[PDB]
From Swiss-Prot:
It comes from the Eukaryota. Regulatory subunit of the ATP-dependent BRF-1 and BRF-5 ISWI chromatin remodeling complexes, which form ordered nucleosome arrays on chromatin and facilitate access to DNA during DNA-templated processes such as DNA replication, transcription, and repair. Both complexes regulate the spacing of nucleosomes along the chromatin and have the ability to slide mononucleosomes to the center of a DNA template. The BRF-1 ISWI chromatin remodeling complex has a lower ATP hydrolysis rate than the BRF-5 ISWI chromatin remodeling complex. Residues 9-113 form the Bromo domain. The chain holds residues 2054 to 2166 of 2168 of the full protein. It comes from Homo sapiens (Human). It is found in: Nucleus. Component of the BRF-1 ISWI chromatin remodeling complex, at least composed of SMARCA1 and BAZ2B, which regulates the spacing of histone octamers on the DNA template to facilitate access to DNA. Within the BRF-1 ISWI chromatin remodeling complex interacts with SMARCA1; the interaction is direct. Component of the BRF-5 ISWI chromatin remodeling complex, at least composed of SMARCA5/SNF2H and BAZ2B, which regulates the spacing of histone octamers on the DNA template to facilitate access to DNA. Expressed at varying levels in several tissues, whereas a smaller transcript was expressed specifically in testis. Belongs to the WAL family. This is Bromodomain adjacent to zinc finger domain protein 2B.
């Protein structure tokens, strides 16, 4: 509350460390469904159904331009990528499996770096 604060967690390396995680996600072999924004002209249904599209290139540009206020808003966009993927893709498809794999990969790096 006013003039009553928990001890200050060092957040000075968060930007660098989110960039490193994002590099590791970009270079994973199963990243290919997620590297670029889904082409809303060429994929029927995507625009109407997926209210907030998100992809790794868009996270990279937001990260680089100071549009994440803190590491939690960064994790929300990463998770959005996978939640969108599960909304639109069967679990038993190459893309559906890619999304589960990447989400697992992310959540481990997240826990190991920050928790």
């Amino acid at each position: 509350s006013m003039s009553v604060k928990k001890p200050k967690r060092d957040d000075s390396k968060d930007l660098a460390l989110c960039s490193m995680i994002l590099t590791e996600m970009e270079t994973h072999e199963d990243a290919w469904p997620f590297l670029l924004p889904v082409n809303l002209k060429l994929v029927p249904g995507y625009k109407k159904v997926i209210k907030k599209p998100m992809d790794f290139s868009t996270i990279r540009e937001k990260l680089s331009s100071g549009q994440y206020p803190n590491l939690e808003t960064f994790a929300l966009d990463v998770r959005l990528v996978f939640d969108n993927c599960e909304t639109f893709n069967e679990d038993d498809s190459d893309i559906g499996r890619a999304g589960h794999n990447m989400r697992k990969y992310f959540e481990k790096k997240w826990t190991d770096t920050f928790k």
